Nucleic acid binder design. Structure first.
Ligand SMILES: [Mn+2]
Ligand SMILES: [Mn+2]
Ligand SMILES: [Mn+2]
Length: 430
DNA sequence: ATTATGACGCT
DNA sequence: AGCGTCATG
């Protein structure tokens, strides 16, 4: 009762750019705006592999991981933009630079955690307390929440999307106790006001639209963000969790979409997040380990404590290329040439990073995949990264992997390599 | 022949 | 340190 911690001590938002790489390309080329369009890597094999899809194209069933030729079967008028190719490989610099644009705007409102190229968590707890003290106890107008959905509302005793959104928002605001600076629902509402402002700033200053979730923790904020896309934000209150989770497939919660979530389903004989509440913490720890078990016990009640880490920059800077089927690397000259291509891209990105961010990487990780291996990485080896020089990094990577060539001939490489990966890690301030 | 990233947990 | 999992623009 009075000592049951309810995990309502923070306001956390997740901001995620809508179909991000597509928006980057649509900003650059107005002919692609408000069209079914997708972003592809490469072109020769099956028209290229789609990695981002505008919402107009999604309506035709176009998805990521689809070959462009197949997408064109679903959507003959689909427009395509191709990722830049540099040194023989896809180069994602344009999207990384656009990401920095957005992250720098978000950082004006609060410290952020970069979770991906297109998304960041925000801890708004302090900004909410400030805005509440500024509000002097006056209530929150629906006009301050023009794109906000309140999950679970309207309910109880209009057939248009926007009409329903406004009905739910009015029910929410009507029930608010705007005199209590410690009410979690009020705190979330003010958080949503701030996120409206943040999203407006992003769109005004970049042209990019985003969606967002506002809740008491990272998992609920991410889940909330997905509920009303594109270009909308969703507030998931603590009180909304029992109904929300009662029909929520376990795989929808971040970290449960793979083998662990499948094992929760199979071992416990359940389907939905809410069904987890019927197990004790010890039962869940017995099946899934002490850490997972405690996390599941709290998560299915809407409670999670993972902090928004103060980190706007990536921890690693890496370069990767697959060599599938008949293009696998089977000679030493080939392996060396591609290691050099990767290392040259890595050098360029590292040198820019050192100038921008006042840090230097100190470890080089070299990863390969060998033909016949079912795993995505067949071997990982680290060595020292003491100089931002591509020829040195590629020679070092070759040295750490050369013992993998099972061939007796040193000119040939067997079995051929289907993946090279160079990653710079362990940054230090400089 | 999804491909190219990047974070994090385990031992 | 090296491996596996989870994520999916
Ligand atoms: Mn996105
Ligand atoms: Mn995202
Ligand atoms: Mn996505």
């Amino acid at each position: 009762g009075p000592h049951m911690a309810t995990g309502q001590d923070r306001v956390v938002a997740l901001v995620d750019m809508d179909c991000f790489f597509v928006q980057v390309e649509q900003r650059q080329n107005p002919h692609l705006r408000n069209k079914p369009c997708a972003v592809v890597q490469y072109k020769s094999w099956k028209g290229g592999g789609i990695i981002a899809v505008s919402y107009e194209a999604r309506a035709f069933g176009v998805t990521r991981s689809m070959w462009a030729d197949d997408a064109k079967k679903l959507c003959p008028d689909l427009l395509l933009a191709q990722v830049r190719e540099s040194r023989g490989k896809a180069n994602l610099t344009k999207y990384r630079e656009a990401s920095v644009e957005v992250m720098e705007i978000m950082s004006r409102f609060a410290v952020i955690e970069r979770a991906s190229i297109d998304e960041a968590y925000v801890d708004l707890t302090s900004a909410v307390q400030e805005r509440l003290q500024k509000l002097q106890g006056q209530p929150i107008s629906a006009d301050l929440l023009p794109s906000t959905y309140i999950e679970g509302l309207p309910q109880g005793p209009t057939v248009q999307k926007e009409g329903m959104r406004k009905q739910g928002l009015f029910q929410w605001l009507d029930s608010l106790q705007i005199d209590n600076l410690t009410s979690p629902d009020l705190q979330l509402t003010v958080g949503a006001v701030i996120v409206e402002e943040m999203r407006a700033a992003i769109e005004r200053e970049t042209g990019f639209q985003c969606s967002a979730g506002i809740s008491h923790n990272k998992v609920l904020a991410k889940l909330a963000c997905g509920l009303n896309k594109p270009n909308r934000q969703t507030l998931v209150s603590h009180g909304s969790v029992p109904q929300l989770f009662s029909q929520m497939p376990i795989r929808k919660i971040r970290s449960l979409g793979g083998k662990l979530g499948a094992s929760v389903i199979e071992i416990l004989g359940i389907e939905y997040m809410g069904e987890l509440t019927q197990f004790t913490e010890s039962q869940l720890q017995s099946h899934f380990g002490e850490k997972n078990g405690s996390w599941l016990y709290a998560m299915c009640r809407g409670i999670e404590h993972d902090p928004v880490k103060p980190r706007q920059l990536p921890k690693t800077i890496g370069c990767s290329k697959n060599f599938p089927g008949k293009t696998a690397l089977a000679t030493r000259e080939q392996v060396q040439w591609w290691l050099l291509q990767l290392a040259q891209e890595l050098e360029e990105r590292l040198t820019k990073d050192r100038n921008d961010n006042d840090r230097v990487a100190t470890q080089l990780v070299v990863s390969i995949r060998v033909q016949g291996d079912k795993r995505l990485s067949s071997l990982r080896r680290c060595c020292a990264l003491t100089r931002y020089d591509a020829h040195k990094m590629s020679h070092d990577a070759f040295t750490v992997i050369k013992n993998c060539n099972t061939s007796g001939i040193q000119t040939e490489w067997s079995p051929p390599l289907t993946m090279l990966f160079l990653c710079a890690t362990k940054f230090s301030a400089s």
